[PDB]
Symmetry: C2
Subunit: 267 residues, 2 copies
């Protein structure tokens, strides 16, 4: 017995911790609904702590910040979108808001000027100060805070489109680069709970190609497959994957989107 | 909005034996003694949280305090003092203090890897050995052994073992300690960071003084050290080549991720305090 920081489960192990496109409905009650209860217990505990720096220094409570990481096409979006639903259902602490980090990308026009279209989605591609000032604002307890939005349809940022956040008990932060760390203070440092949505690399390709092409209608997969090899396959290896260990919870998804394994950080 | 909250000594001061070169006794009651109270109130709160993953999984944990900064800035004594005050709580005694220096490779090793000029860098340490050790501590392992370093001998003391016996609180003093990488790291296991900061051109003076007063005042003491004038040349050059780098590239960048910062003035006094509330 030589100690690991994590605690790994399979679906059946984890499922037995219950209190009593198309989102698979089963996986909610088996994998997510339990996962939600975990976070509920930490939300109130993490409240006490922040309330203990306050009592030291001598006004609702502080936002709980949930990051959600993984490669593109793995299913961060829905994964997060779902937890927004279940967490809100607590009453004890409703008003979960969800913000995509994509809205913080530079507009393509900008990227063109800095020559970063081929490194689109990389950590260079974002507006980290704008991103943080925003996140910093939220958790401060700012009456409101505005965040931009992204168009996967139009392929860029929707100009003058504003997502408003109004002092939420809980915030969720879905993004490619999000669990990232650097010389500047970063948004990663502000999280109270991380999620990494993981899968196999050669496997994810198939999902992305499917994400594309379901959103020339033949052999344009060539194009799609090559944006993977050039942009999205890198960025996973160098920038995203290395953040996996620092996640609070990991969710390995099988070939057919099913979730078998769960490594959880207890320490 | 900024994530931090900055104080001066007077501001912070209004929130209220041993030895070591010479620990200023005033700064205890004004800067440290308050700082200790802060940590006490987080220790019990952070207990509650870890006790909430437990209650979830269906059945206390060591509090881990990191202490960062450049060499010669005064991590050692800074930490050494907090060990004293924190222990005085009863609610949670048995603070143990471990230096990260003991985890350096032995020189002999470094020689083989050609890393003597990069000594103190993150390459210089045994990160796995360091972590299995830290991971072992916080697991709640009945005991755990950690090696030790010789600033006198200039290397690791062979077969010298510092034992840690399930402490309520542990302190982790080291150059590289608030570091982050692709491997899971000891930084990720901290519950509270300290950065001891000062000016760069300034610290040089202190280091040169750290050297030349150790290799002197107790070094020419048992003699069993090769100039007491203009060997500062040598000392000043180990700064420019080894210790000044490593601060810039490896240590300084970790400053923002610290829970508390302690800017020390030219003459060791502590004027400013940036604290992470968020």
């Amino acid at each position: 017995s030589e100690p690991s920081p994590y605690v790994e489960f399979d679906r059946r192990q984890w499922r037995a911790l219950r209190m009593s496109e198309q989102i698979d409905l089963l996986e909610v009650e088996e994998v997510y609904l339990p996962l939600a209860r975990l976070i509920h217990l930490q939300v109130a505990a993490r409240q006490r702590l922040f309330a203990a720096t306050a009592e030291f220094l001598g006004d609702r409570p502080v936002p709980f910040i949930i990051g959600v990481a993984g490669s593109v096409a793995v299913g961060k979006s829905t994964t997060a979108r779902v937890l927004q639903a279940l967490l809100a259902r607590w009453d004890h602490h409703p008003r979960v808001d969800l913000v995509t980090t994509d809205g913080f990308l530079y507009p393509n026009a900008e990227l063109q000027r800095r020559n970063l279209m081929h490194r689109k989605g990389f950590p260079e591609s974002y507006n980290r100060r704008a991103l943080m000032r925003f996140v910093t604002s939220v958790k401060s307890g700012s009456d409101y805070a505005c965040a931009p939005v992204y168009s996967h349809l139009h392929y860029d940022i929707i100009p003058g489109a504003e997502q408003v956040v109004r002092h939420p008990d809980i915030l969720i932060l879905e993004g490619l680069n999000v669990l990232q760390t650097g010389p500047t203070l970063m948004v990663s440092d502000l999280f109270d709970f991380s999620l990494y949505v993981d899968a196999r690399i050669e496997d994810i390709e198939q999902w992305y190609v499917s994400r594309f092409l379901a959103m020339s209608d033949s052999q344009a997969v060539v194009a799609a497959r090559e944006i993977w090899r050039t942009i999205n396959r890198p960025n996973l290896v160098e920038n995203i994957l290395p953040t996996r260990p620092r996640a609070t919870l990991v969710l390995r998804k099988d070939a057919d989107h099913s979730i078998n394994r769960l490594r959880l950080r207890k320490l």
